């Protein structure tokens, strides 16, 4: 009953429309990029991976509107606990599967930080997240495959928190990326 992309193009083409607005309605994208089958044929080109850290690679831009990008996460990559800077943020399994852990928000004094829940994504499963969710941590689930994940923001940032687990205190980072379009930005 939810519209299906049949390639990433076309899901592409469809987030543009659901993104031209100023209402954006949540679990009509995640249906939308949860019906998309991930066909490696079409993101292979994304799919740059490094030795030992994951790699944002950017799909598009769309429009200013949101960016859509792909996570190359190799054997046993992980995250930082972080937040996402106000923006909604749709993550989708490409291949393989990450563990969410969801993270309570620290107040001002410092503690040990609490997990709010944990959870595998199954092959091509959309989550959802925004910082009134909560924090999370991402990580691969497996030391001898990878993990590539589909990523949409909106709106677009490239700051964001990290938060050291033992205490609750954070730390803003740049995030960069390691392709755009397919060609490497080093
Ligand atoms: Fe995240």
Redesign the pocket.
């Given at each position: 009953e939810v519209l299906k992309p049949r390639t990433l193009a076309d899901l592409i083409r469809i987030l543009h429309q659901l993104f031209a607005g100023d209402e954006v309605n949540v679990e009509e994208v995640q249906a939308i990029m949860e019906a998309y089958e991930s066909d490696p044929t079409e993101w292979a080109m994304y799919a740059k991976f490094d030795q030992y850290r994951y790699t944002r690679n950017l799909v598009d831009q769309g429009n200013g509107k949101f960016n859509l990008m792909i996570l190359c996460w190799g054997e046993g990559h992980g995250?930082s606990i972080?937040d996402?800077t106000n923006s909604h943020?749709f993550?989708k399994m490409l291949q393989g599967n990450l563990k969410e852990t969801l993270f309570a928000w620290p107040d001002k004094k410092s503690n040990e930080m609490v997990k709010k829940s944990e959870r595998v994504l199954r092959e091509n499963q959309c989550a959802y997240?925004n910082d009134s969710v909560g924090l999370?941590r991402?990580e691969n689930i497996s030391h001898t495959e990878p993990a590539v994940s589909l990523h949409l923001y909106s709106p677009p940032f490239d700051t964001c928190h990290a938060f050291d687990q033992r205490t609750g205190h954070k730390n803003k980072v740049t995030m960069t990326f390691h392709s755009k379009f397919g060609i490497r930005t080093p």
């Open positions: 995250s972080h996402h943020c993550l997240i999370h991402v």
